[PDB]
Design brief:
1 chains, alpha+beta, HU Protein, Chain A, three-stranded antiparallel β-sheet, 3 helices, elongated, DNA-binding, Hist_DNA-bd, structural constituent of chromatin, DNA recombination, transcription regulation, transcription
DNA sequence: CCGTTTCGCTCAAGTTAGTATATTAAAGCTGAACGAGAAACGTAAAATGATATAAATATCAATATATTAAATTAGATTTTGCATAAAAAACAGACTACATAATACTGTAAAACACAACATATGCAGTCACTATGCCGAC
């Protein structure tokens, strides 16, 4: 399921909703979630999950191909935490 | 085995047996020319799969405790569907006033052609030549 296939299956089910409307809606939601995480704000969707931002202290990296040294500026990285409903439904085991 | 004559067949000219329609009225069929929106294609560009390794970071059970997004109300209020009715403006229903065509009637020049005596070129009336083989006569 890609970004396009996602809009396709959502437009097929929603007949009373223009296909073009669903196409833009999906693109605006993803862009809104990507912009929020950029501003430094978290995301919390009850049932789905919750996006966060974890800090990464600056450390002297090392080229994994050769083994040299490379500086690494301190930055933040997105982190998703599956919700309760998401885990239980995605968990096929016990 | 082969030939000859009768018989099954079809062409050609008489002798009988059978059935009977035209216009309205309104379609119905089908070859051929006419006029846009959406998605499968494709080359090109952007994001991602490829790839590995010691060090860095996330994986998560089991429970106490402060924190918080947010559906669940619950009461407050702009928003929304629907006329009611009068102030205000549009516009037939009247009417005289005003400028304008169809018509009423007088005033005057001149178009359009018969009628009549002449004048005369031109077509018609009457006769011979132009132009070249017939007919008749010989070969």
């Amino acid at each position: 399921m890609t970004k396009s296939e996602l809009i396709e299956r959502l437009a097929t089910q929603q007949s009373h909703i223009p296909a073009k409307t669903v196409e833009d809606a999906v693109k605006e939601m993803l862009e809104h979630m990507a912009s929020t995480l950029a501003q430094g704000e978290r995301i919390e969707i009850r049932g789905f999950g919750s996006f966060s931002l974890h800090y990464r202290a600056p450390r002297t990296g090392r080229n994994p191909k050769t083994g040299d040294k490379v500086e690494l500026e301190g930055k933040y990285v997105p982190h998703f935490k599956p919700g309760k409903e998401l885990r239980d439904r995605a968990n096929i085991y016990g």
